[PDB]
Ligand binder design. Structure first.
Ligand code: MG
Ligand code: MG
Ligand code: MG
Ligand code: MG
Length: 297
């Protein structure tokens, strides 16, 4: 409620840049000493995007480094793992993390090729008959089925620990038309996708944290997690007025640097949370309107 008042004030004064820059100025600064060790330089996609030591995900091998952060939202009681798009040499590490952390969903917000460059390795199989074996981490990954919609794809993957022969279903939610440094095309399209992730059960507290990534794992990934956390806070309290979006973002930034990369992504987060509030507060039919407005079919 007060977020909507604030939204119109900021819009009327045209001060989204200033609001966003103040968040950048106030954001936490913690050491990333492990990420900057020389032996880990080839495990980082971007020189300037590193996990803090205190919140980094540790692999359970005896080099434990992956560029990934546990965003542990204590008040909302939901956690997320935000990570970079894996590199050709860290795809085994990526799936090892998925296994060890007991995640059941992977949210991919980027394409492997963007703006003429490779922003993420091809870390999952594109054909049923060409499964992937990660020899370094003793994991096998098979495409089971996929559901291709107009702007996103949902894939059913089977991940097998070859040491124990345990298998798990992993759901892959792949957003197709959300470029870096931009907001999604519409709140409807974004919320339709977010609530597809929610409906899957992948965010259940009975599972490990969902894994969310884009190329760097901070911009689109931070936008996704900020919207979800704000909606969850509002949901637990049944009180949209009680949510302070900038406070929530600053809290998320205690766990990973740079979350939300542009002022328009911050503005979009307000838009998405204000619209999603309608569903949270009991206008259930609005979810059907998002699906129609998203033209997913
Ligand atoms: Mg506010
Ligand atoms: Mg097992
Ligand atoms: Mg892009
Ligand atoms: Mg934009």
């Amino acid at each position: 409620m007060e977020m909507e008042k604030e939204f119109e004030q900021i819009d009327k004064s045209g001060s989204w840049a200033a609001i966003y820059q103040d968040i950048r100025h106030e954001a936490s600064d913690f050491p990333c000493r492990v990420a900057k060790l020389p032996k880990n330089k080839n495990r980082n996609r971007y020189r300037d995007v590193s996990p803090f030591d205190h919140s980094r995900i540790k692999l359970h091998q005896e080099n434990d480094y992956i560029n990934a952060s546990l965003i542990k939202m204590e008040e909302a009681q939901r956690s997320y793992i935000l990570t970079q798009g894996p590199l050709p040499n860290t795809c085994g590490h990526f799936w090892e993390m998925v296994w060890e952390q007991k995640s059941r969903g992977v949210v991919m917000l980027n394409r492997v090729m963007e703006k003429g460059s490779l922003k993420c390795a091809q870390y999952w199989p594109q054909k049923e008959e060409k499964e992937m074996i990660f020899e370094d981490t003793n994991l096998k990954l098979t495409l089971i089925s996929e559901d291709i919609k107009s702007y996103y794809t949902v894939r059913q993957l089977e991940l097998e620990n070859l040491t124990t022969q345990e298998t798990r279903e992993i759901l892959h939610f792949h957003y197709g038309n959300w470029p870096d440094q931009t907001a999604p095309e519409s709140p409807a399209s974004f919320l339709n996708f977010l609530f597809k992730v929610r409906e899957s059960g992948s965010l259940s507290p009975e599972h490990g944290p969902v894994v969310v990534h884009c190329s760097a794992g901070i911009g689109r990934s931070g936008t996704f997690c900020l919207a979800d956390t704000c909606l969850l806070l509002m949901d637990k309290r049944k009180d949209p007025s009680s949510v302070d979006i900038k406070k929530v973002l600053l809290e998320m930034r205690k766990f990973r640097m740079g979350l939300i990369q542009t002022a328009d992504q911050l503005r979009f987060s307000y838009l998405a949370v204000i619209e999603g509030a309608k569903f949270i507060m009991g206008d259930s039919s609005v979810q059907d309107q998002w699906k129609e407005l998203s033209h997913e079919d």
